Design a protein around this ligand. Sequence first.
Ligand code: H4B
Ligand code: H4B
Ligand code: TIH
Ligand code: TIH
Ligand code: FE2
Ligand code: FE2
Lengths: 309, 309
Amino acid sequence: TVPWFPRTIQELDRFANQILSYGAELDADHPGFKDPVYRARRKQFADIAYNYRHGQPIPRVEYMEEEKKTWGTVFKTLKSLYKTHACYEYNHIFPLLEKYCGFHEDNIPQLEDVSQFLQTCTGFRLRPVAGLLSSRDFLGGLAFRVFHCTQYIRHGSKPMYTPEPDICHELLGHVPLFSDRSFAQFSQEIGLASLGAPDEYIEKLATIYWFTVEFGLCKQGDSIKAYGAGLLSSFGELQYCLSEKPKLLPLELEKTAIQNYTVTEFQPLYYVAESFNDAKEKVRNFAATIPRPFSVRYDPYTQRIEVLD
Amino acid sequence: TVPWFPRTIQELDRFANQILSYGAELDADHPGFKDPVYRARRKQFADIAYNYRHGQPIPRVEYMEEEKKTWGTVFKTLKSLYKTHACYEYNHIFPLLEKYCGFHEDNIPQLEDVSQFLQTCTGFRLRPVAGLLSSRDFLGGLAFRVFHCTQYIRHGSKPMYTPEPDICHELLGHVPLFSDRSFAQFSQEIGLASLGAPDEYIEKLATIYWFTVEFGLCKQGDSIKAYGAGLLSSFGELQYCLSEKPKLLPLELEKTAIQNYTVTEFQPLYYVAESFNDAKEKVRNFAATIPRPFSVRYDPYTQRIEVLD
Ligand SMILES: C[C@H](O)[C@H](O)[C@H]1CNc2nc(N)[nH]c(=O)c2N1
Ligand SMILES: C[C@H](O)[C@H](O)[C@H]1CNc2nc(N)[nH]c(=O)c2N1
Ligand SMILES: N[C@@H](Cc1cccs1)C(=O)O
Ligand SMILES: N[C@@H](Cc1cccs1)C(=O)O
Ligand SMILES: [Fe+2]
Ligand SMILES: [Fe+2]
């Protein structure tokens, strides 16, 4: 039988409050969680996402000095690294976000403003969530050009890296490429292919997604650049990914798909795509092979899924 | 040279206040205009359309007893006539408007509510206008699935017919079919083909549009039905169009396009299409022949026109 999947953009709210985590709460290496004050702060952002409903404007928040300081350190350090570490596509867009989306070190962008901006670029919109969603739900959202985004920020004691998708990751790692026409169409396409697919294919798609969209590397000309959202939001792992420490292998879905990866530490291995474009094509081609007893058609005017066959 | 045309949905506001008329103001047969109280009332609706801007919610209005009485007479009389005079497609949709869009004789629907409804059906939205727009501007709007709609109602002394596109015409004549998926795509398609086209083709398209979408007749089975918006909002002309008075000829674009028509009286001649579907196909096929030094592509996610070639 086919698992239930959203057919309308409003139906996304059904799983909006089903949050997970990478299981680092009990990690002595990430004391952030244990922080009682930080926990209460996190609870506030969670309540906003829980009470939020489709179509409503994303509530604006006033960040604390510790949080603004963290964003400042993260933003400034990454902007410096992008010049020599980020792929061409990313660097060509980033300037636009800074000028038309308020991306600056002395100001944490409000999701409502970012969402309005994205809508004008590619039709993508933000949907605040309490935290990490399952791969099926996240991918399913992309089918409607909806990016479930967190609003809280990583603990200030370790800005260099966090084993959770905080606002820095969502905005500096994902948002930029979601504002790109081609990447946006690519994203929606894989999301559409995931709707109602068996979990063994969802998890396989998730692993491929992990080694490309999240932590992929690609060569442009005779150099190697990072294009994975997870690398672009971690100045700690961004430095490491192009260093002599990690192991590098050519992108090959057949092998990449069955490869294991870590979710609480820097990746010990990365896959290098022949180019940013080839990465998109490979992932796109694999998603199209995902079997299901039907076909789907998205109507952008009504924002509804049409199940055929 | 190519005439200027909107490339964004916001750019539509450029010509929103360029109003025209069918020149009946000096008509002794339409004393409505001359009415000073009616004129002041009309001025109120005009100011709302003038100050209105893209994206804003359409202002709600409280109608006068004379106006509500007029809507009641028009609605009730037409609903009775539709049973035997309107085409199948129209009658299948009308019930939905009554149940989910508040279409009743004791209540003039607010455009904001109608627009929200249309958006869920086919992505069409309403844009309040002070009155009649040029064919180029009206058609251009359809390219963005935008229907420039009036908010005022015809003078109460003659509910049976009016030589102007009042709210009864917009809501009972146009809205129903704009809520139909196929008709909506058809409408946007002709609008896209009209963008930046030479006026000799625009006026020809307008004449064809007049004898089909506005006053077309079509046979379904062994009977003849009306599907033209202008017939479906005039209980006076709706009775006449299927009577022995008017002249009827088969729909033939080559002849229909060069045919003359009246704009202040019942049509002396109507064209009968082989079927409602054949009418759409014929008009669709003609619009595709409209020559221009470029091609257009509409991006529904960004609501922008892309000029190619
Ligand atoms: C699809 C893949 O699992 C990817 O890592 C997803 C999972 N869930 C997520 N959930 C939220 N809120 N934000 C993200 O960036 C992600 N990443
Ligand atoms: C396209 C053709 O000219 C058609 O009669 C248009 C013209 N302008 C219009 N303008 C407004 N506001 N409403 C209409 O229904 C129309 N009809
Ligand atoms: N480790 C990333 C965050 C995430 C990457 C992948 C999922 S969450 C960072 O520090 O920004
Ligand atoms: N004569 C129509 C109105 C219009 C038809 C075509 C343009 S305006 C009616 O009385 O409702
Ligand atoms: Fe991510
Ligand atoms: Fe009309």
